[PDB]
């Protein structure tokens, strides 16, 4: 997993979603939801941020303290464990709060991902910015019902996904497959919640948060109708 | 007005009843009364309505047939906004907005301004009821459309439509074009919103959710629903 | 007189030629002649040609044509029904309906009724012949749609139609815009039948399917194919 | 099978729907399967007998009619409904239900079904069928391939082919498993539109008396994917 | 150029002007197409000498007389004749250019390769060509007929109707306003499209190798979903 | 494709008594019906072992010294003198070559080797009737009793370019996978080539039985002679 080829693999944006982050950091220290394996995390590390990055899956956490001992910055990294929903955290505040590549969308509800904007909210410094990176529901142009189709192809395994759309509870769920030459299957099932930009927006507010900036990707080209997703910057209400 | 689906949905009368059962002997408020299609079979049930309406012109319209029907002593025309309602120490049992009304707000701002009112305007118990597009079930292409209305024997309904699904706004042209080389043209704007928006945008005024149908004959409501009924009482 | 599309289809002689090889030299009876668009093709082959049409003026734009044609004579005007009617003890070698006649009849029973009478007509070894729209070629949508038939440097012709693939029948309006504001609108009604129902009425009414193309020039007929001819004997 | 990828949850809506109709007397299921809808009807005091083909299916239907507590209403027959002969034996319903009747690879076979199951009613008594609506289905010309349900450990996917002419679907049931497990089942169908299935019956000498969406009664229109139709004699 | 949003002409004037620009050098250009000066009157403005082609005259006349009107309409060359059909003697420019499917309007790949043609033999040395082309990838064009909402006014809307042979590779259509009180206006227009494959291989014939390309007049960046491209060809 | 016999026929009834070429020989689809239609068949190929399948079987078919096996390079081939009354290449052989240079540079080997009067053949996918869709799909291709064939692809629109994997998943957990790429070409586009490499087009057919061509078929089948003077 996440050694797969193309569109298969993690979006290639993670350099660029460092620099981004890196511009709000006020050489003060960030907090990701959703660390991973650190596809953003270490290239935060390159640029001298300090990062600390929640994971409720200790399983795969420790795969980040396996990469982090041999990653030439890796001791800017910080693991943490918790859950998006449920982050306490003590006294620390941090610059930058980000969710990348529809962490937010894991927590699958209205009211989880508003609470976990108000948890982000109030561990933010003065001046202190919220950022997410979500699929666009417009742009993804997602049909209703069960879809199934061709993520990626390597030479000797095909990359198909089968998956299951209900376009009222705005849910995603489903099957990352891979067919391998000589009979091999593997499934990864996920689920997603998605929210509408606008809808995103007023879950802010209630968290607390307002609507600073919005770009199709980390390196700020336009958003539109057609963007398949967006980056949001949030910084606290009034 | 027009035949078939180019006028008004035919369910007038159901929606009567619907909000009638709801009524605890007090007063409703329709905002959009229009005509009273809504209006007047409520009144032929015994209830008393008061009717908002923005349009000047066609609330005349609706005087005219308040004196003319049996139970037009019912009907109370209001001018005003969905905005400007300062009605004073009124309440009501009911507070509803049919085919869309709401949507005819043009902003999420708005609409929740317009929700808030409502609720400061129910008694204890009231509820607050609305009929709006089912985005999921609408199929809304992405951009522009045209498609046809309704058949008549000596004219076609057709209509022209923009969508921007980032916006959420509809605006269109229904268009009439008649034997002769007539053509008349009904712009009209909506901006919609999508169920799990307007719960959030419901508890934002003070409201919250307590049923939810396909139409006014209680029919389930479900992602390919065109339409939905939504209930909501203060929090 | 139509350009394109927008007018009737051209395989007028093709249709002549088609039949003309199933005629014994003997008379032949065209349901829907209209103006004649197979019928004199016909006559200038030597085939007697016997058309119904119900329309009593459109009939008579016939009349006028078979006057001033060389082989007029050929061509014998009958005033009655597409259905119920009588016509004595004449008999036909080939009875056909082009170009969706057939389908003029908006009711499975009516066309039923309108393939035995055919049969009644039909002599020995005689053919009833019919040109219809083929439902899974057509790729009709489900509900209203609005298209382009044809364009014209000063007009443009539309067509708006709805389609109720439970009733099977389509009601549309031909639209001819024309620069300078003019607008003319032509409805038509169908009720269609997919092949393997068009065949199990054929049998109902005593006929039995001997051959099936997609045009009158014996192409092969298949899923794609926006029309078939179809050929029926008795049983 | 879960989800989607099973035979649909109306057991008991079937079962409520044909008891209706039954005069306290037996009926006779068309392709009783496991017994999806024999068994609920057996929970409603009513005698099914039940024509499979499937041998495999149709013990399997003896064991657990063996264990159920009303497993002594339902009666099995093994084999082919046009082939056997049931006597001088008469129902008040009989009914095949989910897309049975259209396993009948031909319009001449289906017509020849419905003749024989006029013949086996008793007067005043109803034939039934559940059967896709074409118009509601919206299927694609040709081929296509499509998601049938999701499981933790197993997709269930489907692959078909269409020919709106002959109006067949010949598709297999995909169940790709982890661990590398691949499991095919096949399955044809020849389906009718409602107006050319109700000039069927009409042929086999009987007449459509109602048409719903499904067991619920609710109403049937084009968009419905499926239909509950009733027929009786002429 | 009086029609609203998108039934009016695409508002990138300028942006073409400036592209343009930066690739002309001393002696002027060239516009196949001129139309009202769409193009012509800002590069005017940029101090480029710009000789403007046009068959039409119900139009090159008005263009003579917004050039009289302009401050820099000296600029601004009026030359009637087809972008096949014309011969400009010893003339030579540092830039030939047709902008929004102007290429596309000769009916023909024979038309469009001698035009091609025609325009490399005027170039001077390092001289380039440029066409705004759209690109069928990201037209996302339906096969057969169509109908659709171009545009919305409060007192009329437009309309397309349109045909399209995906083999002849031809579009023809009519450009419809509908107007409250029961006007109808009909612009009838043909087009006979490219894919940039076989765009680039028949500026290979004309002598021409393409240098770069570009989703529109701000280089931005082109892929499968741009609606159009602008290309740029050098002599070979 | 079912149309070998009918490819034969087809190249037979333009091939005469002189001999013709195929490119993309493969396992002899279309070689021995045309063999066993008594025409002499030079087939070229660059991959050795599938062309081995071929002379095993032209040793035990009756009309196999009618095919004439043969190695070489289609844009590039040294054939020496010989020359041909047909050169064809069948189902979309021509689109292996990724690239429009490599194909044009096909075109004109193949119009080289023509003989007077001599015309090239071509059988290719027509776009307008594929319908493709842009970026990746997922497709059922066939139907057994014991396993499926689907097919995955990515298509560019631009580049032109199909590259896909046929699946083929069996009762019993066996999978296998069978990549091919293809660069297509449209009529107008592929006409243009042929221009380029001094070739013009003759006829141009749906399939080998030269029922019509238009946009709704899936294939064509061309007809190329030398260009006129």
């Not at 006294?91 to 989880?112: H, I, M, P, W």
């Not at 001046?127 to 199934?148: E, S, Y």
């Not at 095909?158 to 891979?178: C, F, G, W, Y």
């Not at 929210?195 to 968290?207: G, H, R, S």
Request: with cysteine.
């Amino acid at each position: 997993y996440d050694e797969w080829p193309g569109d298969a693999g993690p979006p290639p944006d993670g350099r660029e979603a460092a620099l981004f982050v890196a511009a709000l950091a006020a050489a003060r220290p960030v907090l990701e939801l959703g660390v991973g394996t650190g596809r953003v995390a270490f290239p935060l590390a390159d640029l001298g941020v300090e990062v600390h990055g929640v994971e409720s899956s200790e399983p795969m956490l420790d795969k980040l303290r396996e990469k982090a001992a041999a990653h030439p910055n890796g001791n800017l990294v910080v693991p943490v464990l918790g859950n998006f929903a449920k982050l306490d955290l003590g006294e620390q505040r941090y610059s930058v709060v980000f969710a990348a590549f529809n962490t937010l969308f894991c927590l699958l509800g209205q009211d989880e991902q508003i609470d976990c904007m108000r948890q982000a909210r109030e561990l933010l410094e003065p001046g202190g910015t919220f950022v997410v990176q979500c699929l666009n529901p417009a742009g993804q142009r997602l049909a209703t019902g069960n879809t199934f189709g061709t993520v990626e192809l390597e030479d000797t395994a095909v990359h198909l996904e089968a998956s299951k759309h209900d376009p009222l509870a705005q849910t995603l769920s489903a099957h990352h497959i891979v067919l391998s030459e000589g009979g091999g299957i593997r499934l990864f099932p996920y689920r997603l919640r998605y929210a509408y930009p606008a809808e995103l927006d007023l879950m802010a507010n209630v968290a607390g948060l307002e609507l600073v900036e919005r770009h199709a990707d980390f390196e700020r080209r336009r958003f539109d109708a057609s963007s398949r997703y967006h980056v949001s910057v949030y910084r606290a209400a009034a």
